[PDB]
Design a protein around this ligand. Structure first.
Ligand code: AXH
Length: 466
């Protein structure tokens, strides 16, 4: 204990107690602690702790700023050495070499291990969370000065290693196993972008290109974008850019499906529209794009659409069953969805919405801090829980599809803007009022509306042309 530095010269060597660090229930699992005690354990002298390092660096922004973290780990690194013993003081003032038995042991067993673990944190930080340094150039400048002024022979390996990663990540900012299938076309010709629409593009190719787009959006989301509900906080655009792209696509696609349905006023044409969206669902199913399946389900369950009982009546029984089964994936807390996801073979796109729901429940169901003996301790178990949910996301992020990109169709779906200049709440009110117009509530009769589509409504089907 007293081999470690005193509190007046070093902040990371206070003894553990119930009022600064708590454990759960082998390396021990940290339940809670002060940021200082978290940093101490993040760079503990007795052993490496890769699980804690990973979980810490994913979740630390919910209790500590990047700049503050960098200051703390540098402070941890700057360990003062103990004074020479009385015999060695006498040796030094006589011009001789001191024994320095404890000093040498302390360097070997405490200073050197801790410093190596600070550099390990730096390496993991730049490798797996380089976006911190991209968003804050001053933070990177601080890291490079720190790493550049480290001195040592054991240390230089780690320095070069860390510098190696920093350069790859800067250079990044400046495939296909088999042959993919033929790109399917229906009414719209290749290049004639002005005619691209729900019924004119081939439903297979709609599902394929949306799956490519959604796969890409799924794979770009970093775990830290979900932590501490930061995508709902005021800094959402900087902290959760990829997450917000995913959410906005889902909103635009879902609301586009609804718009296509309710703005098709002719009953028989609207049946064709609903039927084509179910075919797009079928192809999402074939591709294991569960995100896409549940986007269609979401549109079909929306207030404006779900009430359109005259439309659904004409949908063939086989398509009815496909849509009904898709809904049932969501019943009993996504029981059948989860059973489906663990059974299928790659590639897939998981339903992203369920992670957000479960993370929000975890964030709202657990406190930010714990209290022991009148002192606040950061609730790290809360963060680990959230990190475990983000871990589930990550395990499906390296599943590329063997499908050819079609740049014009991709762009059409990237540029979907069903709301126009309207806000969402007012737009869904408009969709609902449209639904009341096309199929009035039960006492009123059902009026007829003229056709809007000049081209054939017959679907080309969902079986691919080899
Ligand atoms: C009654 N409206 C039927 C309807 C008209 C227009 C277009 C689509 C459809 C359509 C037919 S089945 C369906 C799917 C997506 N949804 C559902 N499926 C099943 C089996 N059960 C549900 C049970 C629900 O609450 C108890 C529910 O609440 C939203 C949705 C369910 C949607």
């Amino acid at each position: 204990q007293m081999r470690l530095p005193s509190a007046d010269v070093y902040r990371f060597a206070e003894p553990d107690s119930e009022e600064n660090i708590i454990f759960e229930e082998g390396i021990p699992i940290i339940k809670a602690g002060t940021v200082i005690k978290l940093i101490e354990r993040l760079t503990y002298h007795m052993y490496a702790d890769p699980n804690f390092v990973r979980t810490f660096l994913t979740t630390y922004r919910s209790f500590c700023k990047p700049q503050e973290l960098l200051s703390l780990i540098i402070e941890r690194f700057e360990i003062p050495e103990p004074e020479p013993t009385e015999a060695d003081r006498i040796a030094i003032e006589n011009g001789d070499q001191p024994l320095s038995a404890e000093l040498k042991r302390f360097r070997k067993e405490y200073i050197q291990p801790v410093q190596l673990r600070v550099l390990n944190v730096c390496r993991h930080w730049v490798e797996h969370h380089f976006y911190d340094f991209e968003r804050d150039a001053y933070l990177l400048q601080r890291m490079e000065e720190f790493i550049g002024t480290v001195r040592g022979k054991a240390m230089k390996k780690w320095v070069e290693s860390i510098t190696k990663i920093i350069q790859r990540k800067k250079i990044a900012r400046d495939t296909f196993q088999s042959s993919p299938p033929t790109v399917e076309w229906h009414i719209s010709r290749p290049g004639h972008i002005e005619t691209f629409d729900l019924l004119t593009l081939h439903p297979i190719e709609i599902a394929r290109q949306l799956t490519l787009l959604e796969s890409d959006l799924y794979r770009a989301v970093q775990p830290s974008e979900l932590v501490g509900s930061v995508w709902t906080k005021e800094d959402k655009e900087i902290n959760s850019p990829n997450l917000l792209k995913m959410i906005r696509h889902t909103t635009n696609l879902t609301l586009w499906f609804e718009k296509c349905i309710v703005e098709t006023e002719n009953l028989e044409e609207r049946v064709a529209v609903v039927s084509r969206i179910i075919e797009i669902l079928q192809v999402f199913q074939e591709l294991n794009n569960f995100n896409g399946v549940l986007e269609v389900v979401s549109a079909m369950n929306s207030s404006p659409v779900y009430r359109l009982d005259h439309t659904f009546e004409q949908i063939p029984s086989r398509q009815k069953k496909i849509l009904e089964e898709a809904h049932e994936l969501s019943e009993d807390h996504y029981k059948k969805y989860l059973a489906k996801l663990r059974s299928i073979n790659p590639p897939c796109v998981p339903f992203f919405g369920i992670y957000l729901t479960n993370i929000l429940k975890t964030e709202e169901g657990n406190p930010e801090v714990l209290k022991r003996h009148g002192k606040e301790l950061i609730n790290f178990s809360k963060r680990r829980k959230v990190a475990e949910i983000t871990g589930e996301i990550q395990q499906y992020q390296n599943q590329p599809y063997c499908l050819r990109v079609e740049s014009d169709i991709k762009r059409f779906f990237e540029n979907l803007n069903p709301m126009g200049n309207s806000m969402e709440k007012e737009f869904t009110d408009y969709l609902f009022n449209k639904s009341l117009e096309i199929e009035p509530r039960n006492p009123k009769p059902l009026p007829r509306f003229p056709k809007k589509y000049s081209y054939p409504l017959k679907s080309p089907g969902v079986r691919p042309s080899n």
